[PDB]
Design a protein around this ligand. Structure first.
Ligand SMILES: CCCCCCCCO[C@@H]1O[C@H](CO)[C@@H](O)[C@H](O)[C@H]1O
Ligand SMILES: CCCCCCCCO[C@@H]1O[C@H](CO)[C@@H](O)[C@H](O)[C@H]1O
Lengths: 256, 257, 257, 257, 266
């Protein structure tokens, strides 16, 4: 089914750019939504992170895994626009010559900034709830924000590669099935696997950092680091969805 | 992406709704009353689970609660009954697309919300009549939880309503975007898991929290004053979630212009 | 929204039943006793779980129990056999809709009910002969639970029976409003989780509880008379719940007036 | 209800089974061989969990074993292979509705049972070629379990075998009454969960418990004798559930008279 | 029923493998590099869970691992890429029904096994580049386990390998026997749960166990003295399991003896 699958991606990447050109507003709103949806997955699993860490549980990371599925299922079911997702779609619509290389940069920049707006809004709204005034949920937000930015560039970059491989292969699957339940199941597996192994997702991290920098619970982060993390993780995401995933699928599916 | 397809579904749903309310009150109110009591049933369950695990000081309590809430919207979706929270996105998207009046939207909203409250009252009543809240760790969960919800700063509540109806309305958005009933239940299952466990606030459900709390004699931690104070703030937040985010957001994605 | 196409089905099934009964008392009763026995299986499984987990002092006891009862209405639905409680609403409507009579409806409720009971008795006899209720925490869980059911005030039982059959019948309502069998089961499993774990009462599962409790000679807490007290209060609650509520409501939603 | 259609379905499945033994003994035995081994896989996994959770004092042992047994009957349905248990309902229903003869049924039963036994033997052998039962609590679990089943009183095993094949068969009955492969797998998971955990007896499953426990050089307290004793009692038990309840029951429900 | 209607599918499908391999030695190898990596993704995940619960000393350890391995074959099937252990059945059953040939089998078998190999390796370096195996119970879990699997008698690894593949292949068999994708994944999860938790030996997944072990800083307790050895036993095993049993067995069930234009069963 590889050729049809290429034609599905190719065709998908043409609709992205087609969309951006007609309405920046629709395009950025679609992306804001996706950034939010992913964030909501963070709200949930950090809440859980906070709960079980306080407890002493060896199960904390496993359950955060299980619980993350809502992040990409929401994106997939809503047909909203996600950065990492597009790393592969465009990276292979481009090799198929459905879209220009610079069609592919406009999409990446807009979807990523669009996602970031979804994050900041979510974070702002999440802080108004007081759910991170203080407490273990708010210390989890704060401690995770810190470790992620205080980790070397190479470590982050490679975790970024394995994250999008997985996020992207999850999107890939949505093109290769017509069951919506298989889509959701596969998203849940790939998200379980990436969160639990310890891989880094740029757009998720926008909500981690967006929340941490809006909560007057004094952390130890600083923008330099968040931006540092987001640069490090984002390229890897690109490498993981564009290179591996994006290129491999063009390869498998192209009538040469 | 079917954004416009989607918006047209939302637009027909707002229409049929106001036709239904206009065409025949008592049906609209029975539809709503069922919704209101289906939601409440997920309170009965998750608070039984609340009282059970909290007595044990289990760290899983809220997680398991979040997990056990799916029934509330699953039932509403699969019976095709009228919930207030979902009406915030449907009517709002529908008003912008000129399918419905603003006061169509107004009526629908006030009705479901009141209809729901009626199903929550009955439920609260009948549930007290079971003696399951006569005393012990479960009564205590209803009393501590109705108290803390009603003593919370308006701002915190308001914002908690927004994040909730974003979750509820999008789980309902999903149901418009798929023809798999299992997919609907799964998505709903995920949304309610996120919003219960994350700590977001849902007016129609709080109805049953205060219904149970005000009808029960062994529950005297809250008053008929907080309940209203909670429903007002939480509901308002809910409306913002549904109309201002989902409702206007879906209208933006789908509108030919 | 399709509450008319749904009141058609409820009427159509309320009809296809009494036609079955008028045409074969034996075919009807074989189906009844099957569902009584299908329901009883979940009682066996969950009381096993009951006995294992109580004996250990898990706070999870009632929860794992709820989670594990889905088989009861699952077998019923998937084998399209006759179950009392599911009929409180299916006869409720059909008649109110003028498709079957007050006559064809007391008929269904004694047959389905007694047939069901036959299934319970036969499961009891066999399960006892497994020796699985000879000595220990499973036979203890049957003893302990059977008494508490029989020493509880009529009123509490009544109300716990209303809620049980709103959930039970709404799971049946769901099986009618969808074509996905997987979704039917998810929905059954949700409603079964919420009624068992909440503490609501089910007439037909209880037939098995007392069936097992009595036929077992290592169990001496019960007597018939107390099992009768329980069954009459619970059967009446079920009826109200499925009949006044789901019966009356769904006719009201689907009736073109 | 589509009982008539369900009973024609079984009748034609019973026809296809015998026409297939007759056509080719080897293909039938191979199919039966596969089912005994697909069932064995289950036992290997749930006995691994058996050993693990047991050596660890956990009250969830038997609950997890039941939850974990689904693969056994799932692989059988999904592979379309020939399982003794199932043939009890199908052959009988099929002979009752005058589609196959008593000799057809006895030959199917005898053949599929020996076919099943062969699969059990190979698996057991190959499993001992793992060293996973050389020593440690997984071996010890095949050891004490194999012995308690061989030493149980005949009546108890007999009745345990009835309840077991009612569950196995009603779960084959469901795969006949749905077109959804996911819903077949859920109903199988539910039924196996119920039969494993409540303590019911399954012949073909025991073949592997004895296939493993014998060939395993790490020893115990077993004897072919005891294994044979278990098998006989449990087979009779299974046959009664399968043919006398399920075969006969479904026959009475779908027969056009 | 429907075993011949099945057998045509493994048949019509053994072909298509050889075909596209004949047509694109690179289109085919990337398609195998992937599979091996999808499988390795299963290992990083469940191995992270081993470290976690093995360092906590939990009894649930091997159970939860088995319940978590599903992602491995689920991605192969859903992506429709090339995996060695699966090929065994399909290629085997392929000859028997006379659609594809012995040398093809062992070639696809040879180019399946090798596509899978890379993926473990690439994935191997990358995961170690995460520094997620520099220090700790996961780094550890990965080493020990890499030890035993090769510090284990040949006879264990062989039979632990045929069983793996009965299970791995029977899941592939089910994905041939349903048009339900959700049904596919579920049966893949049942089989992978059973096979991981019982403790059966999977070739491709060990390609990645061993990559991460060599490739690591904090080492070893290994030497390729293990690998090759371990892999060589399990594979052989894997083949038999899929080839001997599943391949020939499905042929037998499938073969309409109006051929018969050759041999007679009963
Ligand atoms: C309020 C937020 C609006 C952000 C809009 C950003 C749109 C990005 O626009 C892109 O910028 C790239 C450089 O970054 C260029 O290479 C592309 O040509 C251009 O399309
Ligand atoms: C516990 C979760 C199990 C989910 C099982 C989902 C089974 C769906 O199964 C699939 O549904 C599709 C509709 O979406 C149909 O088009 C397919 O024919 C069917 O195979």
């Amino acid at each position: 089914a590889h050729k049809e699958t290429l034609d599905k991606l190719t065709n998908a990447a043409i609709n992205k750019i087609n969309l951006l050109n007609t309405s920046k507003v629709k395009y950025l709103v679609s992306s804001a939504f996706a950034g939010l949806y992913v964030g909501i997955g963070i709200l949930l699993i950090f809440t859980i992170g906070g709960l079980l860490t306080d407890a002493g549980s060896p199960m904390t990371k496993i359950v955060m895994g299980l619980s993350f599925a809502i992040a990409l299922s929401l994106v997939i079911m809503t047909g909203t626009e996600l950065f990492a997702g597009n790393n592969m779609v465009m990276s292979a619509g481009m090799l198929n010559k459905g879209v220009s290389i610079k069609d592919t940069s406009k999409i990446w920049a807009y979807s990523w900034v669009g996602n970031l707006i979804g994050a900041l809004v979510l974070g702002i709204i999440f802080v108004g709830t007081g759910l991170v005034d203080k407490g273990p949920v708010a210390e989890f937000f704060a401690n995770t924000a810190a470790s992620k930015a205080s980790m070397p560039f190479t470590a982050l970059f490679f975790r970024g590669i394995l994250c999008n491989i997985l996020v992207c292969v999850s999107v890939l699957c949505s093109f290769r099935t017509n069951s919506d339940t298989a889509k959701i199941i596969m998203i849940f597996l790939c998200l379980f696997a990436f969160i639990t192994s310890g891989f880094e997702h740029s757009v998720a991290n926008m909500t981690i950092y967006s929340v941490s920098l809006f909560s007057p619970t004094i952390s130890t982060v600083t923008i330099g680091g968040a931006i540092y993390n987001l640069v490090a993780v984002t390229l890897g995401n690109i490498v993981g969805g564009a290179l591996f995933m994006g290129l491999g699928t063009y390869i498998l599916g192209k009538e040469k």
